[PDB]
Design a binder for this molecule. Structure first.
Ligand SMILES: CCN1CCN(C(=O)N[C@@H](C(=O)N[C@H](C(=O)O)[C@@H]2N[C@@H](C(=O)O)C(C)(C)S2)c2ccccc2)C(=O)C1=O
Length: 260
């Protein structure tokens, strides 16, 4: 179609590999570009870890208030929030918000530990019907983004469907779903990605991701004005290991989709 020709031209101009999935919940139509190819998730995987903890809190009602100790040994390469609490505690709610809104890598590792390892995060995906998502490693090695490596990957189609279920569907309880939406809407790292290609009046909740091989990702739920919400996943990776991030590509992909 028209949108797919423009996305293909965008990809060609960028020198990388672009994957897009859009779900328009108004009629459940989909727009896919490389929708069934695997891409490295990098920090977009944090949404699944936070959601898995939220699902646990449907039974363990006070779980989000559980204090978790932050020790110097827990700190990894990027810990903007956890660093402020070393030798103190953060609750699981606070770690979830830090993982989602600041992309804190120590917070992600604490969430993974709460779930019993990367196997526990992947298990949650399977339980809500996502057979594609796989989390294999912890932070920071899950961001190596090596071409062809299936570890820590998903496909655009699978992530779009799963993000729809978590935020607009009923994979989580009502209180848990509302908390996830609130967290995504308060993301602080997304201003130059999907959001930058969309009308300023639209409300967006997103989670970015970046890694080696110039990997630049963003996944978002979009609430347009007076119109059904959309789910948009944009994944981008490049042939050179130390390639620079290309958030402009994600913005341009969103702009092309929003033109439809
Ligand atoms: C060999 C192990 N190894 C290989 C790959 N790797 C990374 O990919 N780290 C990445 C990382 O730690 N990214 C962080 C993360 O994993 O939420 C944050 N998420 C990004 C985002 O949401 O867009 C960020 C730019 C807000 S930093 C990284 C990407 C670009 C620039 C600096 C760091 C590492 O640093 C690393 O330890």
């Amino acid at each position: 179609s028209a949108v797919q020709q423009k996305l293909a031209a965008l990809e060609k101009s960028s020198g990388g590999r672009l994957g897009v999935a859009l779900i328009d919940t108004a009629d459940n139509t989909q727009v896919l570009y490389r929708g069934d190819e695997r891409f490295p998730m990098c920090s977009t995987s944090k949404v699944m870890a936070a959601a898995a903890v939220l699902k646990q809190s449907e039974t363990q009602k006070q779980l989000l208030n559980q204090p978790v100790e932050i020790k110097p040994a827990d700190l990894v390469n990027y810990n903007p929030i956890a660093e402020k609490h070393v030798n103190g505690t953060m609750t699981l709610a606070e770690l979830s918000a830090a993982a989602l809104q600041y992309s804190d890598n120590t917070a992600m590792n604490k969430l993974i530990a709460q779930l019993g390892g990367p196997g526990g995060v992947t298990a949650f995906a399977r339980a809500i019907g996502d057979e594609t998502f796989r989390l294999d490693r912890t932070e920071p090695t899950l961001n190596t983004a090596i071409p062809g490596d299936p570890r820590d990957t998903t496909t655009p189609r699978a992530m779009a469907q799963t993000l729809r279920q978590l935020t607009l569907g009923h994979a989580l309880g009502e209180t848990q779903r509302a908390q996830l939406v609130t967290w995504l809407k308060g993301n602080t790292t997304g201003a130059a990605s999907i959001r930058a290609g969309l009308p300023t009046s639209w409300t967006v909740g997103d989670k970015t991701g970046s890694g080696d091989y110039g990997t630049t990702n963003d996944i978002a739920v979009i609430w347009p004005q007076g119109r059904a919400p959309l789910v948009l996943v944009t994944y981008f990776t490049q042939p050179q290991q130390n390639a620079e991030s290309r958030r402009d590509v994600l913005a341009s992909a969103a702009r092309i989709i929003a033109e439809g």
